[PDB]
Amino acid sequence: QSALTQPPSASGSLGQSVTISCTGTSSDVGGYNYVSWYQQHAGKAPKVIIYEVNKRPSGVPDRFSGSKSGNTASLTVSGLQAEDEADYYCSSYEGSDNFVFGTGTKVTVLGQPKANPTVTLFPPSSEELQANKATLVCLISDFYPGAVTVAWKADGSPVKAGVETTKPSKQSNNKYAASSYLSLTPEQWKSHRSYSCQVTHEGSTVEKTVAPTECS
Amino acid sequence: QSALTQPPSASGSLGQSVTISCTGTSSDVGGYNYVSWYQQHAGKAPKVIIYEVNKRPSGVPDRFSGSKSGNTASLTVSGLQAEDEADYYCSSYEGSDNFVFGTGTKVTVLGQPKANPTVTLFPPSSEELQANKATLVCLISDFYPGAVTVAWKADGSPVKAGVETTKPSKQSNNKYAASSYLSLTPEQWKSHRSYSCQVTHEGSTVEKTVAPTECS
Ligand SMILES: COC(=O)[C@H](Cc1ccccc1)NC(=O)[C@@H](N)CC(=O)O
Ligand SMILES: COC(=O)[C@H](Cc1ccccc1)NC(=O)[C@@H](N)CC(=O)O
Numbered sequence: 042q043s044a045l046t047q048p049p050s051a052s053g054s055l056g057q058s059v060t061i062s063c064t065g066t067s068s069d070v071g072g073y074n075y076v077s078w079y080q081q082h083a084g085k086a087p088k089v090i091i092y093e094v095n096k097r098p099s100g101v102p103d104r105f106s107g108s109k110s111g112n113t114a115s116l117t118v119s120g121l122q123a124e125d126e127a128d129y130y131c132s133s134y135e136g137s138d139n140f141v142f143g144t145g146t147k148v149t150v151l152g153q154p155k156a157n158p159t160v161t162l163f164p165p166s167s168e169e170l171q172a173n174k175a176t177l178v179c180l181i182s183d184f185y186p187g188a189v190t191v192a193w194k195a196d197g198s199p200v201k202a203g204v205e206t207t208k209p210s211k212q213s214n215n216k217y218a219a220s221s222y223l224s225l226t227p228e229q230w231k232s233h234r235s236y237s238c239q240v241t242h243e244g245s246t247v248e249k250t251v252a253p254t255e256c257s
Numbered sequence: 258q259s260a261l262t263q264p265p266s267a268s269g270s271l272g273q274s275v276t277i278s279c280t281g282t283s284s285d286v287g288g289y290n291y292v293s294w295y296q297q298h299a300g301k302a303p304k305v306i307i308y309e310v311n312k313r314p315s316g317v318p319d320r321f322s323g324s325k326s327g328n329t330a331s332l333t334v335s336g337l338q339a340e341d342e343a344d345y346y347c348s349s350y351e352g353s354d355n356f357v358f359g360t361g362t363k364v365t366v367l368g369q370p371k372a373n374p375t376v377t378l379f380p381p382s383s384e385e386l387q388a389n390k391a392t393l394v395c396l397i398s399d400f401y402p403g404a405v406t407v408a409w410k411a412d413g414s415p416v417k418a419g420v421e422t423t424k425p426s427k428q429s430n431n432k433y434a435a436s437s438y439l440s441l442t443p444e445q446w447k448s449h450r451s452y453s454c455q456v457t458h459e460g461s462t463v464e465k466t467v468a469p470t471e472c473s
Pocket of ligand 1: 073138139
């Protein structure tokens with residue numbers, strides 16, 4: 042019926058350790074030894090890092106370890122790293138082949154070094170302009186925290202109009218990425234001098250420009 | 258690792274009957290009758306919706322069926338109810354360590370017409386190769402539901418590492434558009450026949466190839 046009361050948040054520090062614990066009743070959790078832990082990364086397939094309460098599949102490292110106490114098991118992670126930022130779930134065998142999960146926890150490894158973005162501007166394909174099209178993409182990546190402001194200007198004065206930015210998403214490196222594209226026209230692209238993309242991240246503005254190259 | 262595989266998106270309207278797949282071939286023993294189907298709404302904890310190919314726990318409406326087709330675990334949400342729009346995972350238990358998890362299928366009760374992705378592959382601008390670096394940006398715009406799958410190949414052969422994908426973000430036209438990039442040294446760049454990016458999205462599989470002919 043109900044889930045296994047799991048806290049909604051935790052916080053650790055690079056090298057430290059954090060114990061995420063979920064609780065239930067003496068019917069599902071409290072009765073057996075099948076309290077397992079999952080871990081999916083921000084809207085992405087789950088993964089198992091614990092089973093039979095205190096155990097791990099031949100992949101999860103030695104920082105992962107949970108153990109059942111009362112009617113509540115609990116996982117803890119030391120050697121805390123940035124890549125550990127994620128939502129964890131707790132399961133537990135119920136009655137008639139029934140399995141129950143926790144209410145979820147989102148652990149945030151604090152103390153994570155701050156990064157300034159790396160803006161890469163791109164000129165329309167050698168083939169984009171062949172189909173009578175032209176769109177520029179401002180690749181903002183490798184930055185942290187996860188908030189940024191992307192802006193576009195024409196030959197010098199604002200261009201805001203026909204610009205689509207996307208939310209910032211974590212990468213494989215535990216930092217963020219994010220693009221922003223402009224849709225021009227070969228003609229709305231040629232009849233100019235230089236377009237530029239501006240990325241303001243934590244009081245640190247970056248700004249690359251672009252000009253037409255004949256070849257690619 | 259992602260042995261089990263499934264559509265990026267599977268959508269329909271009310272009444273319809275979407276049919277998610279779990280074609281986790283990867284050959285396997287081709288005899289793992291333990292396939293589960295976790296349903297994961299947004300902002301909530303997953304939950305076994307079907308288990309053992311086709312067994313259903315207490316609760317689950319008959320609207321759901323489960324089955325293995327040679328090497329294909331499928332699920333069907335006939336009469337697609339509104340409250341059925343979520344992410345639908347799938348799995349097979351292996352070696353008590355290998356809990357392989359599908360990749361996730363996000364159902365969507367159609368809210369607007371279907372919009373296929375508009376991928377445009379970008380090569381590293383000359384000025385960038387003038388900084389001893391290459392970045393290939395794959396821009397995917399104008400689609401729906403907001404669920405895409407991106408693959409990378411260098412010379413036809415997959416590019417399993419160095420690739421980055423963003424998370425679908427609604428555009429001003431409420432049409433999703435994500436972006437994927439692959440960072441590589443000018444050498445890797447120049448040392449390959451042609452580079453290709455190819456997103457997935459409900460049947461269609463548009464792929465764009467880019468050759469390293471650059472001006473620098
Ligand atoms: C997979 O565990 C089992 O084989 C089944 C339960 C089950 C099977 C398939 C899907 C959900 C639940 N049996 C068990 O887990 C039991 N061996 C353990 C217990 O009674 O606590
Ligand atoms: C029915 O719920 C299950 O499948 C669970 C957990 C699980 C998690 C992720 C992927 C597959 C299985 N599986 C089981 O209980 C069994 N596969 C393990 C056992 O028999 O002890």
